Structure formats: C-alpha cells, structure tokens
Symmetry: C2
Subunit: 240 residues, 2 copies
C-alpha cells in the first residue's frame, strides 16, 4: 500500500509543487499544532538569513509563526502581513522577540465598501506595506473551505456562487479561479491573489478532509506552490 | 533630593493627582520610563485598562511595565492609529497579554478619509475602548515623520507650543483650532482623552517646559512624570 512519503511524491508531481510535507494522520497530538510544527520545519529550510516572510492570518499560520519564533530572531527574518486586520496577527507576532522586524498593514481586513477599500489601498502607509508584501521571498498562508468578518448570509451566497475555498478572504471555485461576482473581493485591503503569485515560494498550511477540495483548487489556481498537510487530507486531495 | 519638593509644588500649582520628579542628576528618557512604570504600578489594579500613546518615552515605559502587565492582566489599548509606531513597545510583552490596536494609519491624507475611517466599525470599537480606559500614558511633544517641515513651521506660526497625540495646543492649553492635521488624525481627540480618570504625561528636557505646562493647564494630563531640571523650568513658566 501507500503512506506519507508516497503522498508527498504524488502531490508534488500532480500539482507541480516545489515542496510538500505530509504529516501522519494520528499521533499523541492534535493535527493543527502538528501542522504548525511541520510548516515551521519547512520554512526553516526554505528561508535564508535576513529574508522576508509574508504571512497570512488564521490559526494554522499563527501556530506556525509561534514555532518559528526562535529562527525568526536568530536568522533576522523580516515578517510582512499579507492582509489588513492588525489584531488578527497578534497571537502569532506576540511570541516574537521585541527586536524582530514586523511590517503590518495599518488598516482593517475588510472595508465597509469597495470605494473605502480603494481609498485605503492608496493611502501611502498602506500602499507601502502592500508593495513590501508582494516583494517577499516566501509566503505562508492558511486555506479556508466553504464546507468574524463574513456574515452567515454572505457565506451562503459565496457557496451558491460556486466558491469552494479561500486564501486571505479571496474565494475561488473548484478549478482554482477567483469567483468574480463576489463583493467581499473589492472590499478587502490586502494583496489580491494575482499579486501573491509574485512571491516565489508560497506555502499553504492546511488540513482536515473537509478541506481537500479547497486545497486542491488552491494548487490548481497557482496560489500556493508548496503544501504542508496531513495524511488523510492528502489522500482525499489525491482522489479529488 | 529637591525631588519631593518639586513634586509638591507641581502637584499644587497644577492641581495634579500624582507626580514624580526624577533626579537630573545622563540617560534621561530611560529613567523617565522607569519613573512612569513605577507610577503606573501603583495606580493600576488587576485587569484594569491602560490607554497608551506613541513615542519613545511611552514605549520605554511599556518595556518596564511588561511583567506587571502580564501578572496583573492589564489590558492595553492604543490611543491613536499608526500600528507600527507601537510595536517597539508591544513587542516587549508576551503573547497572552491583551492588546487592542486601532487598525488604521496615524494620519489620513484628508479629513474626509479620517472621518470615513473613524466610522469603520473595527476602528470605532477601539476608539471607544480607548476612551473608556482607567489610566492613560502619553508623551508630550514641544514645537521648540507624519508631519512636513512646512507644516511644523506653520503650526508654530499658528501659536502652538506642544502636542499630545499629534493634537497641538497653545501656551494657555487650548487646542489650536485652525490646524488641519487635527481633522486628519484617526485617534481619540484630546477632549475625549479627558474622559479617562488618570492621565499620566511622561516628558522631560528643559525645552519641553512650556509644552508640559500648557498640557497641564489644558487638563489633558493630571499626572506627570518628569525630571528635576524640567520641573524647575515648568515652575518658572
């Protein structure tokens, strides 16, 4: 039969990934903390001293930063937020050393209207951070699945419009294309997915079998070109 | 030293609640941080809320207060936008500390944009939290890069002597009313800061005496941490 190493090889070839790690399904520990540890080990090998790491929001990325905090200080890694929201990055940034360089988009995650988001993106202190993010060497993001900032109603319509998952709040369909008649898209302050693709090494950290279709789609769209996930999710991706 | 005597005079002359005057007597700003952290350690009860301004005296203070903030579970909230400008201070706390940050720039490119930003739910929520704080800790600037060299010159021409949180006031302590940066700032205005019951100003340097006196006369702070020479200067203001 087949195990984690074989799932890594298959994922790597099937989605043309640059790096993949697949962690075993059960252990004496919950998946999400173990995803963090694994994403952290992958980033430690990928990042060179003084390089720049763009970070998304969410529990998996915040767990990852925690595990990476020592390497971040020791290796002088500069962190930059991929999205607005400020406070949503504090569980991961809090663990860092005071001398660590962190560049934070000083704006909300989501504006109340598209005109307001467009205004805020043009504010110099925000535009500067958006450019810095797009220029990073490596990115780490979570991946949400349609299976705080979005109402129940919006979530239901996002799904009716064919979204399967999101990165940074931007929703894409089963083929990996951004769903284009979704209003939240034009209201978000951070980097759009088309800009995220500038970053050369884009690591998704995500798991739960429920997320298989979203993770697959994210790779088919090109948004991530490296993956950290778990055994069961990997299997499900491969049959997607 | 003559420190207790300056404390008494300052307290009486400006009707202050608490005052500390540190010896003259070389690392001034470092010792003001110590001073103001000590004052805050005696004022804050467990789980109370501290509103913080930006600048180095305040960020210094925060470093020295960091273990008190953990063990007494002090909740921190930013008085202004800017985010990045608070990071040297908050980086020094651990990750179980509660820190509520205004998610917006310090200054918008126009007053309409400031006003739009202040009405965003996520900004407005933090502004209210800030105004509801138990104690505040701010620096005081003296007219003696969020602002042009050109702007700074016109701000002095308009009769400002000093600022708190980028809000400039004249020698009597009144907010200078024809300065457009005021309507571009995202944070709490000074009139709102005055809701907070204990408002501690931490500032020193003889050149700041006029600004510091004025801040007191306008009621923006009602507690002060400063150094001996500055105290002597304020009192002769």
């Amino acid at each position: 039969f087949e195990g984690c190493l074989e799932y890594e090889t298959q994922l790597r070839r099937q989605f043309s990934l640059q790096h993949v790690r697949v962690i075993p399904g059960l252990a004496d520990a919950d998946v999400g903390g173990r995803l963090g540890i694994g994403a952290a080990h992958m980033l430690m090998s990928l990042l060179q001293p003084q390089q720049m790491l763009a970070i998304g929001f969410g529990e998996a990325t915040m767990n990852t930063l925690q595990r990476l905090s020592g390497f971040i200080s020791s290796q002088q890694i500069r962190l930059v937020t991929l999205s607005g929201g400020v406070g949503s990055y504090m569980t991961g940034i809090g663990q860092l050393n005071a001398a660590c360089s962190v560049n934070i988009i000083p704006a909300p995650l989501r504006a109340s209207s598209a005109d307001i988001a467009r205004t805020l993106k043009n504010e110099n202190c925000v535009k500067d951070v958006l450019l810095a993010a797009q220029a990073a060497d490596v990115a780490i993001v979570g991946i949400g699945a349609v299976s705080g900032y979005i109402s129940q109603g919006e979530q239901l319509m996002i799904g009716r419009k064919g979204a399967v998952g999101d990165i940074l709040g931007y929703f894409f369909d089963a083929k990996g294309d951004v769903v284009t008649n979704i209003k939240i898209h034009n209201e978000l302050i951070g980097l759009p997915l088309s800009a995220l693709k500038t970053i050369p090494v884009r690591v998704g950290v995500a798991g739960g079998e429920n997320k298989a279709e979203a993770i697959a789609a994210a790779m088919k769209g090109g948004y991530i070109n490296a993956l950290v996930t778990d055994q069961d999710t990997a299997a499900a991706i491969l049959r997607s």
